């Protein structure tokens, strides 16, 4: 009822994740892992040791929707990802363990009022993979997601 969620998002860092396919997100939602290119891998690692929470907000390219958001529980570490054109297991080699906070979709149409000061105040749906979102903008975007009844926040809060 927002109280638990607001405590989790308190002093958090927010990053957009863009996936080239639906299957890797379905995979990530089940096993609680994610991997990204080394550029974004470094940033999330720096962000993990620095912030009380690091939140990843997912969107499949060309879906028109966010598919959910998750909190890193570990920095990356060295998963049968569906590798897109340009494949290299090693490129996506580091595996972040993530705890999902919401696995339900949020259409871009519901976040049209929210813009990101850290991306030239462009609408928050706009950004490349790894685009960091300013605290309040990312907090509001997370609050727009519907409650996920499959999710129990106890293990996230317990790890904090």
Curated annotation (Swiss-Prot):
PTM annotation: Tyrosine phosphorylated.
Phosphoserine modified-residue sites: 88
Effect of substituting residue 34 to D: Abolishes RNA-binding and ability to influence alternative splice site selection
Superkingdom, taxonomy of origin: Eukaryota
Record-annotated YTH domain positions: 12-145
Binding site for RNA: 18-20, 34-35, 81, 129
Outcome of substituting residue 91 to A: Reduced binding to N6-methyladenosine (m6A)-containing RNAs
Domain notes: The YTH domain mediates RNA-binding.
Subunit structure, as described in the record: Interacts with SRSF1. Interacts with SRSF2. Interacts with SRSF3. Interacts with SRSF7. Interacts with SRSF10. Interacts with CPSF6. Interacts with KHDRBS1/SAM68. Interacts with TRA2B. Interacts with KHDRBS3. Interacts with EMD. Interacts with RBMX. Interacts with ZCCHC8.
Main function: Regulator of alternative splicing that specifically recognizes and binds N6-methyladenosine (m6A)-containing RNAs. M6A is a modification present at internal sites of mRNAs and some non-coding RNAs and plays a role in the efficiency of mRNA splicing, processing and stability. Acts as a key regulator of exon-inclusion or exon-skipping during alternative splicing via interaction with mRNA splicing factors SRSF3 and SRSF10.
Name by which UniProt lists this protein: YTH domain-containing protein 1
Organism of derivation: Homo sapiens
Residues of the full protein shown: 345 to 507 of 727
């Amino acid at each position: 009822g927002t109280s638990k969620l607001k405590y989790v998002l308190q002093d958090a860092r927010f990053f957009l994740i863009k996936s080239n396919n639906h299957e890797n997100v379905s995979l990530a939602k089940a096993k609680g892992v994610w991997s990204t290119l080394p550029v974004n891998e470094k940033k999330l690692n720096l962000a993990f040791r620095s912030a009380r929470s690091v939140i990843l907000i997912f969107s499949v390219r060309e879906s028109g929707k966010f598919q959910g958001f998750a909190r890193l529980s570990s920095e990356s570490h060295h998963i049968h990802w569906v590798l897109p054109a340009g494949m290299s297991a090693k490129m996506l080699g580091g595996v972040f363990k993530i705890d999902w906070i919401c696995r339900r979709e949020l259409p871009f149409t519901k976040s049209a009022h929210l813009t990101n000061p850290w991306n030239e105040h462009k609408p928050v749906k706009i950004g490349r993979d790894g685009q960091e979102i300013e605290l309040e903008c990312g907090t509001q975007l997370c609050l727009l997601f519907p409650p996920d009844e499959s999710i129990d926040l106890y293990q996230v809060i317990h790890k904090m």
